[PDB]
């Protein structure tokens, strides 16, 4: 298996992965960008607060005609939501990476989310019936998630320039 961030060596880092996950890719992308670059325990607390609707995820790219709330002011926006299903999937993956880090023997409390990336999985193809005997697609857009936790951490001058610098050095 190949992760996107190949620069991160696996000696002092942990990783977790999920594939073909029937959870909304857009919501999962927004939640992952919310927790990107964070401490692990802080990210877990934030995701639990999102499940409890005590703190919100800002909707930035996939935010068209969404509601507004007071809880986006922490991120400097107005459009924020609470995607609890994306939060639950990401909590499961973060706990798996924590368990992998504990198996490796790393210090759990010093870990940060160095890499986290959501890709689109092959689409789940349901059908819906419309008026006048028509059928349209009714697809699910699942996602692949991957995440990596990491420990927190005068040449070729001219002769004139050479003479000028020599005279300035003596003087």
């Amino acid at each position: 298996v190949r992760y996107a961030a190949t620069e991160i060596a696996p000696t002092k880092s942990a990783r977790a992965r999920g594939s073909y996950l029937r959870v909304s890719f857009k919501n999962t992308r927004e939640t992952a960008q919310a927790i990107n670059g964070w401490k692990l325990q802080r990210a877990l607390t934030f995701l639990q607060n999102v499940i409890d609707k005590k703190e919100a995820v800002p909707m930035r790219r996939y935010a068209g005609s969404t509601g507004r709330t007071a809880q986006g002011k922490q991120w400097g926006v107005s459009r924020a939501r609470w995607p609890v299903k994306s939060a639950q999937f990401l909590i499961g993956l973060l706990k798996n990476a924590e368990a992998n880090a504990d198996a490796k023997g790393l210090d759990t409390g010093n870990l940060i989310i160095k890499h986290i990336q959501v890709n689109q999985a092959p689409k789940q193809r349901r059908r819906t019936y419309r008026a006048h005997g028509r059928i349209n697609p009714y697809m699910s857009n699942p996602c692949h998630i991957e995440l990596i936790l990491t420990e927190a951490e005068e040449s070729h001058l001219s002769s004139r320039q050479r003479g000028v610098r020599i005279r300035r050095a003596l003087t």
Binding site: P122, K123, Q124, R125, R126, R127, H132, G133, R134, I135
Partner: protein, 50 residues
């Protein structure tokens, strides 16, 4: 050998599960471009739909 057998049985279902079929008997092919919706013109007289 048994565990390998149900694993093969479960892996055989992946394409039809992605197509969201209700079991292996769901082989219905729907009309994606019906003729009554994609042919003909609408006149002032009798129409084919309201």
């Amino acid at each position: 050998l048994r565990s390998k057998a149900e694993r093969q049985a479960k892996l055989a279902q992946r394409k039809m599960n992605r197509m969201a079929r209700q079991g292996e008997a769901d082989r219905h092919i729907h009309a994606s471009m019906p003729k009554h919706l994609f042919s003909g013109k609408r006149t002032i007289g009798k129409t084919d739909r309201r």
